[PDB]
Amino acid sequence: MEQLSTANTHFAVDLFRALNESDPTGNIFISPLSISSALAMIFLGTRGNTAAQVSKALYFDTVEDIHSRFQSLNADINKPGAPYILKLANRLYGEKTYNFLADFLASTQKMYGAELASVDFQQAPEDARKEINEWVKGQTEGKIPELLVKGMVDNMTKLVLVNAIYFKGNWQQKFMKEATRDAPFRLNKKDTKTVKMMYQKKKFPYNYIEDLKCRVLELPYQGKELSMIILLPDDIEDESTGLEKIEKQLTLDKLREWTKPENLYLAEVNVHLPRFKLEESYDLTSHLARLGVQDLFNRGKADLSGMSGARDLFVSKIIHKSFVDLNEEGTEAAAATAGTILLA
Amino acid sequence: MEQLSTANTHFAVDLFRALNESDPTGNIFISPLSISSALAMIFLGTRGNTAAQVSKALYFDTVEDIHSRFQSLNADINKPGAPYILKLANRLYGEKTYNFLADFLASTQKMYGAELASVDFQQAPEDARKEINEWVKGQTEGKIPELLVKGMVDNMTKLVLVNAIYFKGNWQQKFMKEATRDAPFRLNKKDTKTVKMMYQKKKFPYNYIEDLKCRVLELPYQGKELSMIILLPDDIEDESTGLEKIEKQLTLDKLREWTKPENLYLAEVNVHLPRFKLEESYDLTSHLARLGVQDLFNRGKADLSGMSGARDLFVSKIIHKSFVDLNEEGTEAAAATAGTILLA
Amino acid sequence: EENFNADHPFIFFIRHNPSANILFLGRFSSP
Amino acid sequence: EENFNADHPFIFFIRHNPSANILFLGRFSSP
Numbered sequence: 001m002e003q004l005s006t007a008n009t010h011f012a013v014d015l016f017r018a019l020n021e022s023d024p025t026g027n028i029f030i031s032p033l034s035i036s037s038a039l040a041m042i043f044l045g046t047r048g049n050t051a052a053q054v055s056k057a058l059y060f061d062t063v064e065d066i067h068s069r070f071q072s073l074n075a076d077i078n079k080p081g082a083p084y085i086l087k088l089a090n091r092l093y094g095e096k097t098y099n100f101l102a103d104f105l106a107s108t109q110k111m112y113g114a115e116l117a118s119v120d121f122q123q124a125p126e127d128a129r130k131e132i133n134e135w136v137k138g139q140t141e142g143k144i145p146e147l148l149v150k151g152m153v154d155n156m157t158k159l160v161l162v163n164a165i166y167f168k169g170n171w172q173q174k175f176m177k178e179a180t181r182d183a184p185f186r187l188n189k190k191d192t193k194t195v196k197m198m199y200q201k202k203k204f205p206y207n208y209i210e211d212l213k214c215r216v217l218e219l220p221y222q223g224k225e226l227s228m229i230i231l232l233p234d235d236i237e238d239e240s241t242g243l244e245k246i247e248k249q250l251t252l253d254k255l256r257e258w259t260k261p262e263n264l265y266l267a268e269v270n271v272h273l274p275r276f277k278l279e280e281s282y283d284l285t286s287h288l289a290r291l292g293v294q295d296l297f298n299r300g301k302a303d304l305s306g307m308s309g310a311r312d313l314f315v316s317k318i319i320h321k322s323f324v325d326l327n328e329e330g331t332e333a334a335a336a337t338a339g340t341i342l343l344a
Numbered sequence: 345m346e347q348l349s350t351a352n353t354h355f356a357v358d359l360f361r362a363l364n365e366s367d368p369t370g371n372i373f374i375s376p377l378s379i380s381s382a383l384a385m386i387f388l389g390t391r392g393n394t395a396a397q398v399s400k401a402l403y404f405d406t407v408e409d410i411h412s413r414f415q416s417l418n419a420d421i422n423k424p425g426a427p428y429i430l431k432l433a434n435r436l437y438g439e440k441t442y443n444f445l446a447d448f449l450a451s452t453q454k455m456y457g458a459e460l461a462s463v464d465f466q467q468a469p470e471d472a473r474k475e476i477n478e479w480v481k482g483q484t485e486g487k488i489p490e491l492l493v494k495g496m497v498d499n500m501t502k503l504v505l506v507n508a509i510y511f512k513g514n515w516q517q518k519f520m521k522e523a524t525r526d527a528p529f530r531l532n533k534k535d536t537k538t539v540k541m542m543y544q545k546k547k548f549p550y551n552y553i554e555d556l557k558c559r560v561l562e563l564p565y566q567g568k569e570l571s572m573i574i575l576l577p578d579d580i581e582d583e584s585t586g587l588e589k590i591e592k593q594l595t596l597d598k599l600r601e602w603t604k605p606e607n608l609y610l611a612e613v614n615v616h617l618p619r620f621k622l623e624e625s626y627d628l629t630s631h632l633a634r635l636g637v638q639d640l641f642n643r644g645k646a647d648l649s650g651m652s653g654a655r656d657l658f659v660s661k662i663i664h665k666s667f668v669d670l671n672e673e674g675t676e677a678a679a680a681t682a683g684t685i686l687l688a
Numbered sequence: 689e690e691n692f693n694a695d696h697p698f699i700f701f702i703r704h705n706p707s708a709n710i711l712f713l714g715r716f717s718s719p
Numbered sequence: 720e721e722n723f724n725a726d727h728p729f730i731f732f733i734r735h736n737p738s739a740n741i742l743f744l745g746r747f748s749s750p
């Protein structure tokens with residue numbers, strides 16, 4: 001999993017940096033793995049400079065046997081019998097009347113577990129939209145009920161590639177509801193808003209990053225196969241959120257050094273953490289173009305002939321929706337990414 | 345299951361009659377359900393007079409919601425947790441570089457459980473042949489190890505549709521090996537060959553068909569969800585096998601009246617049955633053409649535009665291989681049918 | 689007591705009893 | 720005894736520990 005996780009994490013960091021450039025102070029919440037999965041399925045059908053752009057920006061070109069490694073990753077993430085709910089699912093919706101290459105379809109099905117659903121984009125794009133949305137809603141236990149809004153698909157849509165990811169796990173160490181009190185959350189040096197602050201003191205993997213004046217905490221979920229990692233500046237010491245120096249030097253390399261299990265030590269920690277819930281929506285198309293994924297979205301330049309043998313398709317939009325609810329018991333998190341492919 | 349089983353049984357009777365016309369005295373062994381399954385998947389992609397011919401000869405036109413009923417039938421046949429092994433599997437092998445219609449592929453996958461395997465017919469038809477054969481061999485527990493021999497696929501093959509069926513069940517009432525003795529089997533009024541004749545006396549569903557001078561016996565397998573039904577003339581009373589009058593009046597209607605559970609009664613029966621094993625091979629193409637399936641096999645007339653949107657494909661061959669081993673413990677039976685689709 | 693001595697050619701089939709579908713169908717006439 | 724009082728903006732992510740893959744990644748900065 002070595003090469004693939006490094007690649008996926010490098011992309012995660014690049015995409016967070018791009019989103020931060022558009023919004024340096026608001027809440028941000030994404031599933032990087034969900035986005036990398038949708039783009040890995042698209043990459044199967046791309047050729048030429050379109051493919052080269054996708055593999056460079058997504059770091060797929062740094063992974064030997066990329067699609068085989070993803071296949072193994074999906075098998076592990078979806079393993080049955082775990083003490084938490086974790087689902088990562090892929091699906092293809094194709095226009096009924098459209099012809100796809102056999103090898104493209106066989107590979108997305110074998111490597112990504114994506115089965116092909118045949119829908120009527122040409123005569124009934126609304127029914128098709130609602131079918132896609134119902135599937136994502138079902139995969140995310142209702143948390144992403146309308147991934148694609150009116151106008152996202154029309155009678156010219158030929159293919160929609162969809163990834164949904166869902167997680168619900170209890171904390172290894174739960175907070176007691178009775179210790180949760182109203183407390184002030186400082187947005188910056190002088191605005192304050194009241195939050196429900198949860199409290200517990202327990203031994204957790206921990207570190208203070210001396211040179212960044214930042215604390216790192218790991219909060220295991222039940223089973224310890226997933227953890228939440230939190231990076232918290234010692235104080236708000238800049239003219240916005242307090243995170244500016246961390247975000248400034250966020251790299252694959254530093255993120256790894258800060259949060260590596262080997263670099264955390266068990267400490268008895270007083271944890272105050274707000275109870276919170278985020279629902280976010282992104283049109284990733286322009287952010288991805290800024291990252292170097294250009295021909296893919298360009299009607300005249302896109303090479304998707306791996307999907308139908310001709311340069312007649314392009315990707316109009318990649319959209320991402322996400323959800324997280326963090327409380328005393330644990331965390332329920334969901335996301336879904338759709339890439340819409342239209343006739344060029 | 346009412347309409348579909350009647351249809352499938354009517355076809356079974358028609359195809360047995362056709363095979364009997366080519367060989368009125370040899371052993372015959374087929375899986376009618378296997379052949380009907382391969383043709384039901386082909387029928388999904390046929391249009392025009394090609395479709396009309398297939399549905400008439402296979403009786404699919406007498407079944408409302410034919411493919412949905414087959415989907416239900418496959419679910420029941422393959423149900424987990426049964427006290428016998430019964431597998432009915434479907435698969436599609438498509439040329440890597442060929443483009444298929446989305447709706448055709450989605451339907452064969454949803455209704456028949458056939459997944460699409462992408463193979464290299466164009467550059468490496470031998471590897472593709474061996475891949476198909478290995479899959480069928482695996483599905484039939486080694487009993488059909490080479491469904492397609494050299495020359496059955498070439499670099500012009502675009503699609504091979506495959507059904508395999510496998511059954512192994514113990515008798516509800518097993519024969520004791522120690523009671524099995526050599527005894528003479530009469531092929532006709534004066535040739536004889538020695539067989540291992542098994543013996544037991546037990547209560548079995550039974551009937552003597554008065555007007556045909558024929559006995560009917562039902563031998564349940566363990567669980568009683570499958571039975572073997574045997575129709576035995578009272579003696580060899582014609583100038584060949586003894587079965588001529590039965591075969592003469594074999595119809596869906598008579599077969600039903602002779603072997604219906606309602607028409608059998610429990611009787612204490614002395615059963616002498618040979619231990620035997622058959623392996624048969626059929627090129628069904630001409631028999632099916634004789635049955636009325638003509639355009640499908642004709643390069644100029646075949647309409648398979650449901651598979652790729654164009655009239656560029658036709659079926660060159662439908663071949664069927666089968667196997668049965670009947671002994672004291674039970675029966676192991678296997679069959680597989682491949683329809684090879686080439687460029688017209 | 690009945691006698692079913694199959695020492696001459698017969699037709700046989702394996703039926704899926706719930707659906708009544710014939711899974712396999714044959715004639716044994718040549719050992 | 721350490722203190723981790725998250726009453727000002729922080730970055731958080733959910734990691735799949737066996738593979739080290741980041742499944743979800745966020746910044747909480749505006750209640």
Ligand SMILES: [Ca+2]
Pocket residue numbers: 138141
């Ligand atoms: Ca559910």
Ligand SMILES: [Ca+2]
Pocket residue numbers: 482485
């Ligand atoms: Ca096996």
